[PDB]
Design an enzyme around this catalytic site. Structure first.
Site, short mmCIF file in Angstrom:
data_model
loop_
_atom_site.label_atom_id
_atom_site.label_comp_id
_atom_site.label_asym_id
_atom_site.label_seq_id
_atom_site.Cartn_x
_atom_site.Cartn_y
_atom_site.Cartn_z
N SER A 133 0.84 -1.19 0.00
CA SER A 133 0.00 0.00 0.00
C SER A 133 0.88 1.24 0.00
CB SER A 133 -0.90 -0.01 1.24
OG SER A 133 -1.83 1.06 1.25
N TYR A 171 -1.98 -0.74 10.49
CA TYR A 171 -2.07 -1.24 9.12
C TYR A 171 -0.75 -1.01 8.38
CZ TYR A 171 -3.93 -1.36 4.21
OH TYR A 171 -4.31 -1.55 2.90
N1 LIG Z 1 -8.84 -0.39 -1.65
C1 LIG Z 1 -7.71 0.31 -1.58
O1 LIG Z 1 -7.76 1.52 -1.74
C2 LIG Z 1 -6.40 -0.43 -1.28
C3 LIG Z 1 -5.24 0.34 -1.28
C4 LIG Z 1 -3.98 -0.19 -1.02
C5 LIG Z 1 -3.84 -1.55 -0.76
N2 LIG Z 1 -4.98 -2.36 -0.76
C6 LIG Z 1 -4.74 -3.78 -0.46
O2 LIG Z 1 -5.40 -4.58 -1.45
C7 LIG Z 1 -5.81 -5.84 -0.85
C8 LIG Z 1 -7.31 -5.97 -1.07
O3 LIG Z 1 -7.98 -4.76 -0.78
P1 LIG Z 1 -9.46 -4.50 -1.28
O4 LIG Z 1 -9.71 -3.07 -1.27
O5 LIG Z 1 -9.71 -5.24 -2.52
O6 LIG Z 1 -10.36 -5.14 -0.12
P2 LIG Z 1 -11.90 -5.57 0.02
O7 LIG Z 1 -12.63 -4.91 -1.05
O8 LIG Z 1 -12.30 -5.29 1.40
O9 LIG Z 1 -11.77 -7.12 -0.26
C9 LIG Z 1 -10.95 -7.96 0.58
C10 LIG Z 1 -11.12 -9.38 0.08
O10 LIG Z 1 -10.31 -10.24 0.92
C11 LIG Z 1 -11.18 -11.17 1.59
N3 LIG Z 1 -10.78 -11.52 2.97
C12 LIG Z 1 -10.47 -10.65 3.96
N4 LIG Z 1 -10.14 -11.30 5.08
C13 LIG Z 1 -10.25 -12.58 4.74
C14 LIG Z 1 -10.01 -13.66 5.59
N5 LIG Z 1 -9.63 -13.49 6.86
N6 LIG Z 1 -10.19 -14.90 5.04
C15 LIG Z 1 -10.58 -15.07 3.76
N7 LIG Z 1 -10.80 -14.02 2.97
C16 LIG Z 1 -10.66 -12.76 3.43
C17 LIG Z 1 -12.53 -10.49 1.63
O11 LIG Z 1 -13.63 -11.44 1.73
P3 LIG Z 1 -14.76 -11.34 2.86
O12 LIG Z 1 -15.31 -9.98 2.86
O13 LIG Z 1 -15.90 -12.34 2.38
O14 LIG Z 1 -14.20 -11.86 4.10
C18 LIG Z 1 -12.53 -9.90 0.23
O15 LIG Z 1 -12.86 -10.98 -0.66
C19 LIG Z 1 -5.42 -5.73 0.60
O16 LIG Z 1 -4.11 -6.27 0.87
C20 LIG Z 1 -5.38 -4.22 0.85
O17 LIG Z 1 -4.52 -3.97 1.96
C21 LIG Z 1 -6.28 -1.80 -1.02
#
Ligand SMILES: NC(=O)c1ccc[n+]([C@@H]2O[C@H](COP(=O)([O-])OP(=O)(O)OC[C@H]3O[C@@H](n4cnc5c(N)ncnc54)[C@H](OP(=O)(O)O)[C@@H]3O)[C@@H](O)[C@H]2O)c1
Ligand SMILES: NC(=O)c1ccc[n+]([C@@H]2O[C@H](COP(=O)([O-])OP(=O)(O)OC[C@H]3O[C@@H](n4cnc5c(N)ncnc54)[C@H](OP(=O)(O)O)[C@@H]3O)[C@@H](O)[C@H]2O)c1
EC number: 1.1.1.206
Lengths: 258, 245
Positions: free
Chosen positions: A143, A156
């Protein structure tokens, strides 16, 4: 050289957000994909949507906060892909928004556990599977928060720092085994993770808007703009690239004072 | 301006190595020092040595892996210093040397627990004592292993990467409360084969001494260092600067 045809992939957390975009990206390039989340109903709608598009995707429900479930998931993935994994994307992760002095022991366990420990542990038990493929790729998701400090996400950021350093170590230790290891570190991507957070608390709305104004490109990224780089790093074209953390952030981290 | 006279300090793991040197350095420049380790008789001989040379130093035995003992240590520090802490040096740490695929859950818990969680939790609960001093300083011990990859210490590197990041967050959040937070990241300070290799990699061609690290930690606490926060400074004889010598 620019295809993933006949590759096996495990993408954690693929039912929404960047994770959904990644399985659709690799599967579109020709990878056999396996994914997982914590809601079977949501996981099921995805598998059908993907099944309708001609994408070859499987999946099961798994909470990655449990060691025995991680152990089970890898057994499944080893049976389905026949003891061969080409790609592992440790996408799944969570965030909690508080002041640094308010984070609890349980928050600590939630954040470091799913963001670092789960990701690292999967990489461990995946090693022999990735080795056996002779063309392995481990991609972690970092991130902009793993570059400089952002408000409300101190713990985080710490977990994303562990990921960044773990990337370098695996890259050096496993290079001889024909496994490359990189992290993709997004800017603000508009997903459930951010929409839930800004719905919950309008202070998070504030912070996010000010991350976007800080972004030279002046907009939030799209999931596909992140999966595109993740797909590339798995191309054999990318065969000299390892140990890297690459920001896809619209210039956020290049911006000092604009 | 280059004085630590009448400051109060907590440095963890002060019974040997760099922590020992830091206690002597900080106490030799005027601070009242509180320190701790895991065994009574080791900690007690230090307390005897330091008192004989006129140093103002207190201490008690603590296991920084217990969250109850961390709470109890801060309550004791709060009592003897009257609710006022100027300096916290998160020095205590451990290394296990394994390949990345071999580290167990117990390893993880010891290394992450000691290096990051205890250092973080202590910072959370010292916060009001530092805010109260109106001249606070928290200092983490990082590593060259928190810069780039070193053999046998993948899980340890990760715990230092977490520390690097937390020192930027805390620095940015607590700057308004006049608390400054920095990491000092030493190189090899006084597996032989491995350590031998790291030393020919460092341009100075030698391992450092403990007081070459504590010298920097003491300066970072001077009022002279008032505009320096959120930094990680390697004291490494040039190790990290060197790509191919
Ligand atoms: N969105 C941003 O702006 C952003 C920015 C920088 C980095 N990131 C990184 O990108 C990655 C994904 O982010 P995102 O925004 O796509 O997140 P998201 O929309 O909240 O989706 C997270 C996904 O991971 C799954 N997940 C979370 N905990 C889990 C667990 N304990 N066991 C199994 N599955 C799990 C969630 O499923 P469930 O909901 O069904 O549990 C969902 O499918 C992460 O590493 C985040 O730190 C995101
Ligand atoms: N030495 C180097 O070359 C080097 C290089 C880079 C970074 N560092 C960093 O510098 C710091 C100190 O290193 P060092 O070499 O001086 O270490 P050391 O010689 O191993 O001493 C560590 C000190 O911390 C104490 N300690 C460890 N675990 C503890 C626990 N769970 N509870 C309470 N006290 C505990 C130890 O006391 P007991 O033995 O009595 O428990 C000891 O007094 C560490 O954070 C390390 O990561 C050192």
């Amino acid at each position: 050289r620019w295809s993933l045809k006949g590759t096996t992939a495990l993408v954690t957390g693929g039912s929404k957000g960047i994770g959904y975009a990644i399985v659709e990206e690799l599967a579109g390039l020709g990878a056999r994909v396996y994914t997982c989340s914590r809601n079977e109903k949501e996981l099921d709608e995805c598998l059908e949507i993907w099944r309708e598009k001609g994408l070859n995707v499987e999946g099961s429900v798994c909470d990655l906060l449990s060691r025995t479930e991680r152990d089970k998931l890898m057994q499944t993935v080893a049976h389905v892909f026949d003891g061969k994994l080409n790609i592992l994307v440790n996408n799944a992760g969570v965030v909690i928004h508080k002041e640094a002095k308010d984070f609890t022991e349980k928050d600590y366990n939630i954040i470091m556990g799913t963001n670092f420990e789960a990701a690292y542990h999967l990489s461990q038990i995946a090693y022999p599977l990735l080795k056996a493929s002779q063309n392995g790729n481990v991609i972690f998701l970092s991130s902009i928060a793993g570059f400089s400090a952002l408000p409300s996400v101190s713990l985080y950021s710490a977990s994303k720092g562990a990921i960044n350093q773990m990337t370098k170590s695996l890259a050096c230790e496993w290079a001889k085994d024909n496994i490359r290891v990189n992290s993709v570190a997004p800017g603000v991507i508009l997903t459930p993770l951010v929409e839930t957070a800004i719905k919950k608390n309008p202070h998070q709305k504030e912070e996010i808007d000010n991350f976007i104004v800080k972004t030279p490109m002046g907009r939030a990224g799209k999931p596909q703009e992140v999966s595109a780089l993740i797909a590339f790093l798995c191309f054999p074209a990318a065969s000299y690239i390892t140990g890297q953390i690459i920001w896809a952030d619209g210039g956020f981290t290049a911006n000092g004072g604009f």
